[PDB]
Design a protein around this nucleic acid. Structure first.
Ligand SMILES: [K+]
Ligand SMILES: [K+]
Ligand SMILES: [K+]
Ligand SMILES: [K+]
Ligand SMILES: [Mg+2]
Ligand SMILES: [Mg+2]
Ligand SMILES: [Mg+2]
Ligand SMILES: [Mg+2]
Ligand SMILES: [Mg+2]
Ligand SMILES: [Mg+2]
Ligand SMILES: [Mg+2]
Ligand SMILES: [Mg+2]
Ligand SMILES: [Mg+2]
Ligand SMILES: [Mg+2]
Ligand SMILES: [Mg+2]
Ligand SMILES: [Mg+2]
Ligand SMILES: [Mg+2]
Ligand SMILES: [Mg+2]
Ligand SMILES: [Mg+2]
Ligand SMILES: [Mg+2]
Ligand SMILES: [Mg+2]
Ligand SMILES: [Mg+2]
Ligand SMILES: [Mg+2]
Ligand SMILES: [Mg+2]
Ligand SMILES: [Mg+2]
Ligand SMILES: [Mg+2]
Ligand SMILES: [Zn+2]
Lengths: 183, 98, 46, 201, 307
RNA sequence: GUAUGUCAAAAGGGAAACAGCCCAGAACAAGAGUUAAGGUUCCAAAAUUAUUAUUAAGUGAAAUAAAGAAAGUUUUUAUA
RNA sequence: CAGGCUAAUUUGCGCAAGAGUGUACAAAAUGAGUGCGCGGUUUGGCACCUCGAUGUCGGCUUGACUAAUCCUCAUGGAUGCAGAAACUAUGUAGGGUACGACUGUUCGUCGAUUAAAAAGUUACAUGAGCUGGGUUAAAUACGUCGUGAGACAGUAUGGUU
RNA sequence: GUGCUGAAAGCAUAUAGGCACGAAAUUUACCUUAAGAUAUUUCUUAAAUAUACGUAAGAAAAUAUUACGUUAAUAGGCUUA
């Protein structure tokens, strides 16, 4: 029981993560060679990763009942990477229980009214548990079409270097070497 | 029929893998029983029949590991998983030609 | 135009082509013939 | 391709300027393929185009030749564009020096054609409008795209001229779309010696 | 979703961050996209608020008899303009009539205080195509705002019919009268199909209910007469509502706008009848602060009894 | 009718939901215990695990629609 | 009775092949006897649900949906597309498809208009919305059958919705 | 359904690639209802405002909606046309 005794303030805090839908991802890409052929994370492979963060499942204290999820700011959703002809052949449906009122729309036609952010919210929404926390978690996914967003100051940092920045890894290893100078 | 017995016509790579290991585990049971008798200079009519008219997993074709003969099918072949107790039964040889 | 399921060349000038294939549909196989316009055929419905 | 290997004989006066690989940022796409801007200047004008980067041009300024080649012939995408990029450059070279022409013949009683100016519909200052009387209750008038010269040596004969073949042959197709040749009397608009086999009766 | 294909929360405001100057495709939805697909149909000028006074016929000098509805304008003024930068669209707020100060609330008393306009009876916005349609604040619009022969659209609330049945509300045929019919003469009959159709009454089913008292637009009504003295604008045909009800009269959306000369001449008449429409407004806006700052401090009673 | 099993009188895991099918026979608790069928990107416990080919049709991915057509594509065997 | 399973069969269709018709010429039209199928609208087969209760043929009222299209819109082929009209076929279901005589009738026949006066599913949609002419109770008669009481996908008049 | 350029495949080809024509269907437009961001150099320190009551109504099954209440033409009466 001692493992849990302590200050759990920072274990439950909301971290503001960031990812660009255009930056190549060696881990979430199916093409891994050559270096120039690596593609960004596909729609479903990016949503599968985000849904894991919104559920807080990346934390060692995850519990499905506690809403220990985090925020995820997705940028460049206009350049959402998709394979095949999904952009023009995939269809989204709707019905309000009135016979004949079946609304259909393609991915590209849906990206003209509400942009690529709406296509990613539907992918993440289906990957989340269908319960009373689905709308709270999906609201923590802030997707934008370009590189601009109001959370450029919220993104988690480490020594002034935003995570995902060019030199963010060096700033982390420098802070841990200073923490070892103690009993 | 209106009663749904949802059984796919083919097996998955996970079922085929376990099938390979079951065909491989029965080969070790006959090889152990045969080598144990050979050391004593003995033989069993059932063990001599198996080694004579039954192949090993390393000698069977893929179509004999995941399929069986069925005269009611278009091409006289039927998924082995469509056999009763197919997981605890021996089935490796089909009629010649089919 | 005669829409068939088994399109065949009826002369030496008939040509097999796949038209109307774009990012939204797969298209159909046509039998275009400049000599005789009665050799026009299609494979598939919309 | 057997056409891409054929060198492109650059006649006197023509000047080919091969740019360098570039990539225009497209927010809708994650990775644009590099292209090369090729400028073909000469006496009649200047044409341009952007070819893929996998196509390599060996511009031989000494013997006035330019051979095309791709990085991999096993790829269907590179084999196709190899011959297509060659066909377009051929039309550019032979279009900026000599020019492309198209002749339209108007068959049918009462069919005429004259070149006039309609300032009320001028898409640009000094646009020529080909007036066509093809039996319709209303007058048919079409403005020549910027860069084409239209003339009518005779009432039943139009002569289009331009450095871009795609623009010349496309405008002639818009005129012919008003009266397609019929098989019973040959009435219509024939483009570049087009013919139609008439019927018996 | 709640409304449409949008799964976005209702309290987030990401619009300003999805800009087109950044290289993105122009969205198909939104105010800008909505204003672009309505530019051909949006009128150029504003409208006026009139009161339906009755119905008559217009007699021509050669033997023409034309039915028409008489609409009267009662001190119609321009109260405020809506700009695309502050409100997201172009429009003009127009007034009608007057109202006692005691009945007007303090929120609206200060709304008219900062404009120099007496309290009005009603207000309504009339969309315009561009900023050229915005008019000075406080100028009165007379029947000459339109010209004889001009086509307009008259909007108004229809006559209330109360709880209506199936015949008067949906034109149902009813049932038999004497051939054995039993207690079902004006009833609706069946309300749907059996189990195979949902085991439920489908949404949108036409049933009895309240009828009328809704807005109704009559389009393409020519202007037969225009009288500045009487203040009337005679339009052809009928108009929704009762006598003494306010209506909205504006140029037709399905017709080409009036000639460019007329649109300018009318704008030039507002500057003659009201040479100083901004000076009176700036003076009114300046007084609002002086009184507004007095209400804050609490010394308003001193300014009232200043002289 | 016959042969074998289950259900009936059998819960539990898998087959989306499931009397009869694939596993397995519930006396009660504990365990990142060991396994069967079955599975391992997310809903949802576990591989976005390695190797070689094929498909570009979202074909297909846990209920194979037929004969048949065709410069779709790949391999192999001939052959110029 | 309706639903379910099935699909022999149908008053529902398609694809393949091509004897033959088309003055000529297989595939403009036409398509013997067949083969491979879809579909679930007919007559059946089974008897799985309901007999401590699922009201039934037509009509009226009010719908919703399918598309294998009668009209309207775009359009390919047509020795057999001169024009016009029409035939055939590909798109396409937004709207419309009315009136009257006969019959309980669905259906069908017929009169006269019309751009046209096409169909089907929904418990052969809808009787705790209506009607009750038919079918199917007690009464009575005719014919037929039975020795008789009586019976009859035989016919009549009447009959608590 | 009909085209232009044009190769893979020296040709051909409206096949790849680059452009385009085109229907009572669709979408937009137009009309109504809903939605309620937002706007006003708007109001409020215990209020602004709203309701109740009374006279009513462009409203009306109840409810609600929309005006008025003496510094007042809301309803009735009265006078005139
Ligand atoms: K219900
Ligand atoms: K699928
Ligand atoms: K009687
Ligand atoms: K075509
Ligand atoms: Mg079932
Ligand atoms: Mg009333
Ligand atoms: Mg009546
Ligand atoms: Mg009565
Ligand atoms: Mg239900
Ligand atoms: Mg029993
Ligand atoms: Mg069990
Ligand atoms: Mg599963
Ligand atoms: Mg474990
Ligand atoms: Mg997991
Ligand atoms: Mg033709
Ligand atoms: Mg429409
Ligand atoms: Mg019924
Ligand atoms: Mg009922
Ligand atoms: Mg060519
Ligand atoms: Mg060509
Ligand atoms: Mg168009
Ligand atoms: Mg409207
Ligand atoms: Mg304020
Ligand atoms: Mg108060
Ligand atoms: Mg009341
Ligand atoms: Mg009075
Ligand atoms: Zn041919």
């Amino acid at each position: 029981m001692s493992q849990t005794v302590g200050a759990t303030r920072l274990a439950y805090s909301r971290v503001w993560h960031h990812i660009s839908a255009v930056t190549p991802h060696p881990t979430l890409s199916t093409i891994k060679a050559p270096s120039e052929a690596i593609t960004p994370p596909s729609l479903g492979r990016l949503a599968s990763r985000i849904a894991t963060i919104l559920m807080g499942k990346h934390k060692p204290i995850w519990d499905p009942s506690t809403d220990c999820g985090d925020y995820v700011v997705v940028t460049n959703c206009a350049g959402l990477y998709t394979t095949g002809h999904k952009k023009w052949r995939k269809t989204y449906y709707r019905h309000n229980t009135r016979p004949g009122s079946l609304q259909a729309i393609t991915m590209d036609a849906l990206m003209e009214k509400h942009g690529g952010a709406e296509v990613l919210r539907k992918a993440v929404s289906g990957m989340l548990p269908k319960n009373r926390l689905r709308d709270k978690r999906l609201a923590r996914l802030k997707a934008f079409e370009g590189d601009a967003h109001p959370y450029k100051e919220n993104l988690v940092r480490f020594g002034g270097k935003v995570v995902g920045a060019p030199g963010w890894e060096e700033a982390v290893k420098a802070i841990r070497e200073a923490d070892m100078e103690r009993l | 029929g209106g009663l749904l017995w949802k059984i796919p016509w083919r097996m998955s790579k996970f079922q085929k893998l376990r099938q390979r290991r079951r065909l491989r585990a029965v080969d070790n049971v006959v090889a152990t029983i045969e080598n144990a008798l050979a050391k004593k200079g003995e033989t069993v009519k059932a063990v001599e029949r198996w080694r004579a008219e039954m192949p090993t997993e390393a000698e069977m074709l893929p179509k004999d590991k995941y399929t069986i003969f069925d005269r009611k099918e278009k091409r006289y072949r039927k998924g082995i998983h469509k056999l009763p107790k197919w997981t605890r039964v021996s089935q490796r040889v089909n009629p010649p030609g089919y | 135009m005669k829409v068939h399921s088994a399109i065949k060349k009826r002369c030496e000038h008939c040509k097999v082509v796949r038209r109307k294939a774009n990012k939204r549909q797969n298209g159909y196989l046509y039998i275009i013939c400049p000599a005789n316009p009665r050799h026009k055929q299609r494979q598939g419905y919309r | 391709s057997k056409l891409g290997r054929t060198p492109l004989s650059i006649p006197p006066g023509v000047e080919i300027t091969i740019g360098e690989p570039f990539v225009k940022r497209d927010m809708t796409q994650w990775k644009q393929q590099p292209k090369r801007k090729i400028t073909v200047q000469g006496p009649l004008g200047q044409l341009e185009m952007d070819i893929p980067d996998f196509i390599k041009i060996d511009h031989d300024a000494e013997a006035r030749r330019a051979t095309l080649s791709v990085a991999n012939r096993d790829e269907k995408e590179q084999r196709e564009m190899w011959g297509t990029t060659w066909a377009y450059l051929n039309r550019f070279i032979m279009g900026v020096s000599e020019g492309h022409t198209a002749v339209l013949r108007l068959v049918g009683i009462g069919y005429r054609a004259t070149i006039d100016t309609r300032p009320e519909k001028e898409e640009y200052p000094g646009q020529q409008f080909v007036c066509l009387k093809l039996g319709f209750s209303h007058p048919v008038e079409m403005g020549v795209p910027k860069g084409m010269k239209a003339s009518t040596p005779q009432p039943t004969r139009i002569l289009l001229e331009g450095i871009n073949r795609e623009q010349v042959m496309t405008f002639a197709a818009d005129i012919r779309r008003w009266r397609v040749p019929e098989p019973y009397k040959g009435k219509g608009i024939f483009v570049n010696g087009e013919t139609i086999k008439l019927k018996q009766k | 979703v709640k409304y449409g294909w949008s799964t976005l929360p209702k309290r987030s405001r990401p619009t300003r961050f999805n800009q087109v100057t950044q290289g993105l495709p122009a969205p198909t939805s939104g105010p800008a996209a909505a204003l672009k697909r309505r530019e051909k149909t949006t009128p150029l000028r504003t409208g006026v608020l009139a009161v339906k006074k009755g119905m008559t016929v217009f007699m021509g000098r050669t033997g023409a008899r034309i039915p028409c509805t008489v609409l009267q304008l009662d001190r119609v003024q321009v109260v405020a303009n809506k700009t695309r930068a502050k409100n997201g669209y172009w429009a003009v707020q127009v007034g009608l009539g007057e109202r006692r100060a005691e009945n007007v609330g303090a929120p609206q008393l200060g709304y008219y205080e900062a404009k120099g306009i007496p309290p009005k009876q009603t207000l309504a916005e009339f969309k315009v195509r561009n900023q050229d349609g915005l008019l000075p604040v406080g100028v009165q619009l007379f029947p000459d705002w339109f010209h004889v022969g001009q086509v307009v659209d008259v909007r108004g609330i229809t006559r209330g019919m109360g709880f209506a049945g199936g015949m008067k509300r949906h034109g149902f045929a009813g049932q038999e009268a004497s051939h054995g019919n039993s207690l079902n003469h004006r009833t609706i009959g069946s309300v749907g199909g059996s189990q195979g159709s949902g085991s439920r009454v489908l949404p949108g089913k036409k049933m009895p209910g309240r009828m009328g008292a809704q807005q109704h637009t009559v389009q393409n009504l020519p202007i037969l007469m225009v009288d500045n003295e009487l203040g009337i604008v005679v339009v052809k045909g009928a108009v929704a509502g009762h006598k003494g009800a306010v209506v909205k009269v504006q140029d037709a959306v399905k017709k080409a706008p009036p000639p460019e000369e007329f649109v300018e001449a009318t704008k030039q008449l507002l500057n003659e009848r009201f040479p100083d429409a901004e000076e009176k407004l700036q003076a009114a806006r300046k007084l609002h602060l002086e009184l507004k700052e007095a209400r804050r401090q609490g010394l308003i009673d001193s300014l009232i009894k200043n002289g």
